[PDB]
Amino acid sequence: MLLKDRVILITNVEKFAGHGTTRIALAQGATVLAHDPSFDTPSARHKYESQFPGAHALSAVEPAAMVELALKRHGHIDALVNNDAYPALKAPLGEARIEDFRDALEVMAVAPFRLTQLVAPSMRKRKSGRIVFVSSAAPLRGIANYAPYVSARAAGNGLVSSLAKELGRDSITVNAVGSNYVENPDYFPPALLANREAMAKMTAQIPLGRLGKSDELGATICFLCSDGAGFITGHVLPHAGGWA
Amino acid sequence: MLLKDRVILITNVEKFAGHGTTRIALAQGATVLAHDPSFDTPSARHKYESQFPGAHALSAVEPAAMVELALKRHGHIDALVNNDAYPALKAPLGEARIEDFRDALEVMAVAPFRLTQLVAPSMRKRKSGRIVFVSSAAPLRGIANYAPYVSARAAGNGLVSSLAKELGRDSITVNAVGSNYVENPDYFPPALLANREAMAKMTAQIPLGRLGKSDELGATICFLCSDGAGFITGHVLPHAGGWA
Amino acid sequence: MLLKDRVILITNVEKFAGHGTTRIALAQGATVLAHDPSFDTPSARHKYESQFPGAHALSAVEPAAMVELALKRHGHIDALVNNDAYPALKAPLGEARIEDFRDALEVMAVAPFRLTQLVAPSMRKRKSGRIVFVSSAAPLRGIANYAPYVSARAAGNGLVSSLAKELGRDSITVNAVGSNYVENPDYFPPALLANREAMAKMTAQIPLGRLGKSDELGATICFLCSDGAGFITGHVLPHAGGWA
Amino acid sequence: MLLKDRVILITNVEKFAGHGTTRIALAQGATVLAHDPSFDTPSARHKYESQFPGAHALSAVEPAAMVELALKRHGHIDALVNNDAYPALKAPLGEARIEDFRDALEVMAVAPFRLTQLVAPSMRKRKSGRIVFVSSAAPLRGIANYAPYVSARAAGNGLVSSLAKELGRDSITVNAVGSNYVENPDYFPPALLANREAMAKMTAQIPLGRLGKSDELGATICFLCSDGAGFITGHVLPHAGGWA
């Protein structure tokens, strides 16, 4: 049980890496606490909890209230998984909307920074913790016509080494996983997986020649939450089949 | 004359790398057009122009009007130097203000993206151009207690490879210079240079053992504007004495 | 059991990351096969096997014979851990010996390439495998007066993305772990750990403020050997407490 | 004249970036001294000198003698351009010859290190200098079936930040230019340029959609030799049309 007795809070669990991460963390023995904007609704909480028995859906959805509630459940949080996702909008220079660029930055850089400000103080008092940004490999290569999206992922990735330095003396590590080409609801959803021509083009440009599994991304994030990853910090770990 | 007959537009010329860049571009034969928020004022225009004879201070200060005016002067712009600077505020997690994080992103990522959207179309029609972001090396190492600043510089740097891809078929290059420890009014001003103890600590952590000259940063930016740098694109060039 | 039923071959097991890796791999359920130049001697084999019950010390020490023997034991190898270490000799330009530079390259780049050439064909036929170079973070920052050492580690790291591409279609991943400041017999041995002044200087320059454990390096390597790391390839994972 | 009164020594001038660099350095006012293995022959010296009037072909071909002679010509060397090239042999794991891997490392890492050991002491005494490795972008992406070549270029690149640190206090900078897809006799020769199908495949994978000019590589190297690049050190500058 690699995460035996670790309390992991995963944000926006209905998006991006939430399910993979919940699934693996539970299989590795974690206590999982999950936030989602939908979790003010009992039926959404019930559906998550019935799919992932042992995971707890938090009924507070706003940041400060959600953290206070997460902390009340067991008294502490061992790892924060900041699972943040805004749509990658096709946005050539000539059509890109500045308001969408600001919204991408809000979701992918300002919001996870806020959550870190809320959770970090409890970790410091413990002298232990893990903060994992679930992010994108895209800034490592760049993507024509998606520069606002890539730039906002870069802003996210660009918190990591500074926060690592700032929290490292309290033994808390800070890392990101730079995902790409992983089956997920935000970027590689089922409709895309069923487009044979899209898939042929995509997999021809990945060294492993396939898309990644949400369980692979989950296992990566889980590994960075574990005790065994305690000497890794400040890092953005590419998880894109060799594409970066 | 490495920039003989090149029209270079430098933004926010009273900040950061503006003066170094003006000075070297003129010495290398360029026609320099300069924007600054102060340039709605005749005396500010007159002071710039008297310090840098041959440089033209543009009297429009808002982006769209400033670009239209810059373009009217000679009919074209060969290089855009996006010279963007917001204060690096000491901002530990516990004190950082979210509104300052948003403002940093506005100044250092959204504003230069906007300016690029305004200038790029004229270059495309020419099939030639240069876009240089004047940015920071800080994201290459990270800085404790300045993560909002570093993250916003990372967002800036994170436009570069995506825009390079998007504009490369029209032969326009897109690069950034990742400055640090360069004498300049924003980050390394005279007051700091006169603090002997600050300077001893700073230069002990730079491999070249000294701060950089605004003429060195200017010469770097000028080089990326030149014809000889036409096969360099998508790159963030560290200019920090070996610190990154 | 994250490595349940995986056959892991670890080279030069008496050096560098061998013991940490053996220890964690066994705790995670692996079958461990170990090479060492000392293992032509029965007593050395007996000492390893008594310290790590369930690990098998191979009695062939030369590459081709050692691989043929490793493969005979169970019929296959799921992961190769190329655990390679040559001394980091203090070698300023003026004193560096060219023959030592060649020897460093032999040990840290040519030898692991050879071992990969020997093991890879068996993996290809299976369409599964893992190759992990145990390497150094030093090339990510550079070190004055040790450039031959750093350069040879860079050569090692510089196999990874090319081999990843070459073997990725057969689903085999290729990665490196860029260690530094990890308690180990080659670079951070007990004598160094007992030098209070050395330790104070070292830990002042690591963000986590401490040296890493051989179990942390072992757990990292084990993670890259696991099924859960199947979408990570071509990567050099820094494992140096934030130092890179 | 950006390199007015600078003495530049370019090695192996008949290969790779030699001609581009000679041509631009002379146009920018440099005094060029050139080494080549062919320059023990008067007619080869005469042919270089007649093609590049003002450049001096050195008649000593072995390292120590060649340096002593270069230094005698004017008393000093302001910049060393280590222009090193060994063939990129197609070498899948199953066919790669270990002796060719060693030879690649000899030519691309050990030889330029040797030349640096020979030239550096004269610079230190002056407190000024420039060392530029002419290298490859290939390690920044990796190339299937060429891993020995890529690895040896990585070893080369892997000298740069360590030597930069070691020589930076004497104000000497050390950088590399990571070329790829530049017309040159070693890697992109005329025969390749005339293969329409090869060229279509190559340029489809470069963001600028074309090969680079030997004058562009030369201008890059010249820029790093100049006074204006005095705050750049420890860097590997990609020069590959956006490919890295």
Locate the domains of chain D by residue range: 2-244
- Count helices and strands in chain A by DSSP H and E runs: 11, 7
**Residue D49, token pair as written in the block:** 């000198």
* Alpha carbon of A35: minimum distance to chain C alpha carbons (Å): 24
Name the residue among B93, B157, B234 with its Cβ closest to that of A120: B93
D54 Rama class: left (phi>0) / alpha (psi -120 to 50) / beta = left
Map residue C31 onto helix, strand or coil. Answer: strand
Measured between alpha carbons, how far is B109 from B153 in angstroms, rounded to an integer? 7
| Inter-chain CB proximity B219 and D228 less than 8 Å | yes
DSSP structure class, residue B184: B
Q: Which of chain C's residues have a Cβ under 8 Å away from the Cβ of D234?
A: 142
* Alpha carbon of A114: minimum distance to chain B alpha carbons (Å): 7
Task: With CA atoms as reference, report the closest residue to C152 among C98, C188, C114.
Answer: C98
Name the residue among A215, A217, A237 with its Cβ closest to that of C237: A237
In sequence order, what E strands does chain D have? 7-10, 31-34, 56-57, 79-83, 129-136, 172-179, 235-239
**Interface list for A 186-215 with C (CB within 8 A):** 206-209, 212-213, 215
Q: Which helix (H) or strand (E) element contains residue A9? A: strand A7-10
Task: With CA atoms as reference, report the closest residue to B20 among B177, B222, B241.
Answer: B222
Task: With CA atoms as reference, report the closest residue to B6 among B27, B37, B24, B32.
Answer: B32
Name the residue among C207, C219, C229 with its Cβ closest to that of A220: C229
Q: Which helix (H) or strand (E) element contains residue A15? A: none
Map residue C243 onto helix, strand or coil. Answer: coil
Q: Which of chain C's residues have a Cβ under 8 Å away from the Cβ of D109?
A: 101, 105, 151, 155
Task: With CA atoms as reference, report the closest residue to A157 among A193, A132, A191.
Answer: A132
- Torsion, CA A18, CA A23, CA A24, CA A30, rounded to 10: 90
Catalytic residue among D48, D86, D149, D181: D149
C241 Rama class: left (phi>0) / alpha (psi -120 to 50) / beta = left
Map residue C134 onto helix, strand or coil. Answer: strand
Q: How far apart are the first and last CA of chain A?
A: 30
What chain B residue is nearest to D224 in terms of C-alpha separation? B220
**Residue B210, token pair as written in the block:** 């000294």
Q: Vertex A159, ends A175 and A66: CA angle to 5°?
A: 80
Q: Which of chain B's residues have a Cβ under 8 Å away from the Cβ of A155?
A: 105, 109, 151-152, 154-155, 158
| Inter-chain CB proximity A158 and B164 less than 8 Å | no
Measured between alpha carbons, how far is C65 from C80 in angstroms, rounded to an integer? 16
Q: How far apart are the first and last CA of chain C?
A: 30
Measured between alpha carbons, how far is C230 from A2 in angstroms, rounded to an integer? 18
SS3 of B2-43: CCCCCEEEECCCCCCCHHHHHHHHHHCCCEEEECCHHHHCHH
Q: Is D86 a catalytic residue?
A: no
Identity at D68, one-letter amino acid code:
E
DSSP structure class, residue C73: H
Residues in CB range of B185: below 8 A, 6 or more apart: B14, B15, B16
In contact, A141 and A93? CB cutoff 8 Å: no
Q: How many Cα atoms are found within 13 Å in the side-chain-facing hemisphere of B3?
A: 31
Strand order in the sheet with D235-239: D56-57, D31-34, D7-10, D79-83, D129-136, D172-179, D235-239
Q: How many Cα atoms are found within 13 Å in the side-chain-facing hemisphere of A73?
A: 22
Task: With CA atoms as reference, report the closest residue to B179 among B87, B241, B109.
Answer: B241
| Inter-chain CB proximity B169 and D209 less than 8 Å | yes
| Inter-chain CB proximity A207 and C182 less than 8 Å | no
In contact, A140 and A244? CB cutoff 8 Å: yes
Identity at B183, one-letter amino acid code:
E
What chain B residue is nearest to D213 in terms of C-alpha separation? B231
Q: Name which of B171, B232, B235 to mutate to probe chain D: the one with the most chain D Cβ atoms within 10 A of its Cβ.
A: B232
**Residue D90, token pair as written in the block:** 């197609």
Residues in CB range of D159: below 8 A, 6 or more apart: C147, C150, C151, C154, D109, D112, D113, D116, D133, D174
Sequence-distant contacts of C56-63: CB under 8 A, at least 24 apart: C56/C31, C56/C32, C57/C13, C58/C33, C58/C34, C61/C35, C61/C36, C61/C37, C63/C111, C63/C114, C63/C115, C63/C118
Q: Which helix (H) or strand (E) element contains residue B153? A: helix B147-157
**Residue B169, token pair as written in the block:** 């078929």
Measured between alpha carbons, how far is A138 from A152 in angstroms, rounded to an integer? 10
- Name the percent of chain A in helix, strand, coil, to the closest 5: 50, 15, 35
Measured between alpha carbons, how far is C10 from C83 in angstroms, rounded to an integer? 7
Measured between alpha carbons, how far is D206 from D222 in angstroms, rounded to an integer? 24
Sign of CA dihedral D229, D230, D231, D235: positive
Q: Vertex D136, ends B207 and D211: CA angle to 5°?
A: 125
Identity at D236, one-letter amino acid code:
V
| Inter-chain CB proximity D208 and B228 less than 8 Å | no
C54 Rama class: left (phi>0) / alpha (psi -120 to 50) / beta = left
Largest CA distance in chain C: 53
Task: With CA atoms as reference, report the closest residue to D190 among D207, D206, D214.
Answer: D214
Please state, as a whole number, how many other Cβ atoms lie within 10 Å of the Cβ of residue B230.
22
Chains near B with 3+ CB pairs less than 8 A apart are A, D
Residue showing tokens 């002679």: D69
Q: Which of chain D's residues have a Cβ under 8 Å away from the Cβ of B213?
A: 230-231
Q: Calculate the alpha carbon distances from A223 to A13, A232, B62 in Å.
A: 18, 10, 49
* Alpha carbon of B40: minimum distance to chain D alpha carbons (Å): 33
Measured between alpha carbons, how far is A239 from C66 in angstroms, rounded to an integer? 33
Task: With CA atoms as reference, report the closest residue to D151 among C108, C141, C132, C119.
Answer: C108
Task: With CA atoms as reference, report the closest residue to A149 among A92, A193, A191.
Answer: A92
Residue C22 pairs in a beta bridge with none
Please state, as a whole number, how many other Cβ atoms lie within 10 Å of the Cβ of residue B87.
12
Task: With CA atoms as reference, report the closest residue to B115 among B21, B9, B217.
Answer: B9
* Alpha carbon of A148: minimum distance to chain B alpha carbons (Å): 7
Measured between alpha carbons, how far is B179 from B10 in angstroms, rounded to an integer? 16
Q: Which of chain D's residues have a Cβ under 8 Å away from the Cβ of B238?
A: 232, 234-235
Name the residue among A165, A213, A231 with its Cβ closest to that of C213: A231
Q: Which of chain B's residues have a Cβ under 8 Å away from the Cβ of A157?
A: 154, 158
Map residue B208 onto helix, strand or coil. Answer: coil
Largest CA distance in chain A: 53
| Inter-chain CB proximity C233 and A220 less than 8 Å | no
Largest CA distance in chain B: 53
DSSP structure class, residue D234: S
**Residue B56, token pair as written in the block:** 């033209």
Q: Name which of A161, A203, A208 to mutate to probe chain C: the one with the most chain C Cβ atoms within 10 A of its Cβ.
A: A208
CB contacts < 8 A (B, D): 117
Q: How far apart are the first and last CA of chain D?
A: 30
CA D43 to centroid of chain Cα atoms = 24
In contact, D166 and D198? CB cutoff 8 Å: no
What chain A residue is nearest to C241 in terms of C-alpha separation? A231
**Residue D140, token pair as written in the block:** 């920044």
Please state, as a whole number, how many other Cβ atoms lie within 10 Å of the Cβ of residue A171.
18
Measured between alpha carbons, how far is C68 from C75 in angstroms, rounded to an integer? 10
| Inter-chain CB proximity C98 and D114 less than 8 Å | yes
SS3 of D185-213: CCCECHHHHCCHHHHHHHHCCCCCCCCEC
Q: How was this structure determined?
A: X-ray
Measured between alpha carbons, how far is A171 from A121 in angstroms, rounded to an integer? 13
Identity at B117, one-letter amino acid code:
Q
In contact, D241 and B231? CB cutoff 8 Å: yes
Chains near D with 3+ CB pairs less than 8 A apart are B, C
Residues in CB range of D107: below 8 A, 6 or more apart: D84, D85, D86, D152
Q: Which helix (H) or strand (E) element contains residue A57? A: strand A56-57
A190 CB-contact burial (10 Å; exposed 0-12 / middle 13-18 / buried 19+): exposed
**Interface list for C 121-180 with A (CB within 8 A):** 161, 164-165, 168-169, 171, 173
Q: Which of chain D's residues have a Cβ under 8 Å away from the Cβ of B165?
A: 207, 242
Measured between alpha carbons, how far is D82 from D116 in angstroms, rounded to an integer? 8
Task: With CA atoms as reference, report the closest residue to B165 among C21, A122, D205.
Answer: D205
Measured between alpha carbons, how far is D123 from A123 in angstroms, rounded to an integer? 51
Task: With CA atoms as reference, report the closest residue to B35 among B68, B70, B72.
Answer: B70
